Amino acid sequence: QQEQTIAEDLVVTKYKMGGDIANRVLRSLVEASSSGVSVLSLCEKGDAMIMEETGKIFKKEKEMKKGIAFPTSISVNNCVCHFSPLKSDQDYILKEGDLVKIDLGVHVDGFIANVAHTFVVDVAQGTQVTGRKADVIKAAHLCAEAALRLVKPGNQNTQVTEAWNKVAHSFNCTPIEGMLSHQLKQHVIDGEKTIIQNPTDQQKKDHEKAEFEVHEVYAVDVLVSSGEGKAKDAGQRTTIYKRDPSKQYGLKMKTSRAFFSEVERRFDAMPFTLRAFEKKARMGVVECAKHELLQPFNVLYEKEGEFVAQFKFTVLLMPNGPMRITSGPFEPDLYKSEMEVQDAELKALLQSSA
Secondary structure: OOOOOOOOHHHHHHHHHHHHHHHHHHHHHHHHOOOOOEHHHHHHHHHHHHHHHHHOOOOOOOOOOEEEEEEEEEEEOOEEEOOOOOOOOOOOEOOOOOEEEEEEEEEEOOEEEEEEEEEEOOOOOOOOEOHHHHHHHHHHHHHHHHHHHHOOOOOEHHHHHHHHHHHHHOOOOEEOOOOEEEEEEOOEOOOOOEEEOOOOHHHHHHOOOOEOOOOOEEEEEEEEEOOOOOOEEOOOOOOEEEEOOOOOOOOOOHHHHHHHHHHHHHHOOOOEEHHHOOHHHHHHHHHHHHOOOEEEEOOEEOOOOOOEEEEEEEEEEEOOEEEEOOOOOOOHHHEOOOOOOOOHHHHHHHHOOO
């Protein structure tokens, strides 16, 4: 009963302002991406820009929390998600032709605006991206377009799941199995109401069918692969975590207890990167993650040589229709695929207005 929702104009404003910041920071990072650029540097730049820009709004409200909802993550080629290296980790240096996914989130007073975008590094003027890179990027963006049209009051999450499989297969691509798009609420990045990608038979049973409703907010997250779509851990150090306020445990080590306290104060229940702490965080993390006080956002990979594309946007289900508050700077004429959507209903859906 105490929820602040988009029924309130002020709440819509807070979402829109966080969305404007997310959009601006994303575009800055895309422009800063060129051959030879350090992924660590881009992650640090993104996060700092989020803090600086949120610092400049609602200045008179000195107690209002605002800042990072999802730390800047830059996941290249077959890397799926959540790459945000520690200073001590192996960095990654961008190469011409790399496929890059930038994923980040901003919050204003707990209202979250998440965005992610895919592009290719240093595409030359007057050329197009072709091949499997083009296939997977076009597939992922058409999945995003389909979701923009289908995530509306009265529709079912299952409709989205089905459409995504049809679109992706049109390009001989596969949405990554089991990945979720969450409803957002104030202070809640991971609402239990979700859209699931390409669920296994077991995932279909464990996942709840649901109907979208007016005043709900979603961070729609499309991740599509040129390969089988069964993402796996590959020994990469997890750096992104979130506190889970539903779980409690009295920690045995003073370092763990103090780390717990610092996490709660600084981040509440927003995902954060360990780079925000490096040694003393590493030990505190161990006990907290072990007893489920922190949830990891692991770095997952598709098969070597394959490509994973992503588009994520946040949408407000307003009485007058869906209102998207974030998006990436997608240029369709850049991508040429041998394939196209052939399905009549799907083609109709994609040509219709959003």
